[PDB]
């Protein structure tokens, strides 16, 4: 139902229960989670996403998402 998957990333602050949260906070929300990014200074992840999750964590940017790149509202490849 989603708008498609997506990849977001958080800057090296975020803590480790908020990036559990922020994705569980998409789960419960709509958005959900198939696959994640553990590496060393790198915690981002992927999966489905949607407009109304990405302005949540998309205005908030910036002190919680160090790069985000939607791939939903793409139409026409």
């Known amino acids: 139902g989603s708008a498609g998957k997506f990849i977001v990333i958080f800057k090296n602050d975020v803590s480790e229960d908020k990036i559990r949260e922020t994705k ?3 789960i419960a929300e709509g958005g959900t989670i198939t696959n994640e990014y553990n590496m060393p200074g790198m915690k981002g992840f992927a999966g489905e996403l949607t407009p109304q999750s990405l302005t949540k964590f998309q205005g908030l940017q910036g002190d919680l998402i160090d ?9 026409t490849q």
């Open 24 to 26: 569980d906070e998409v």
């Open 67 to 75: 790069s985000i790149e939607e791939d939903g509202i793409v139409t």
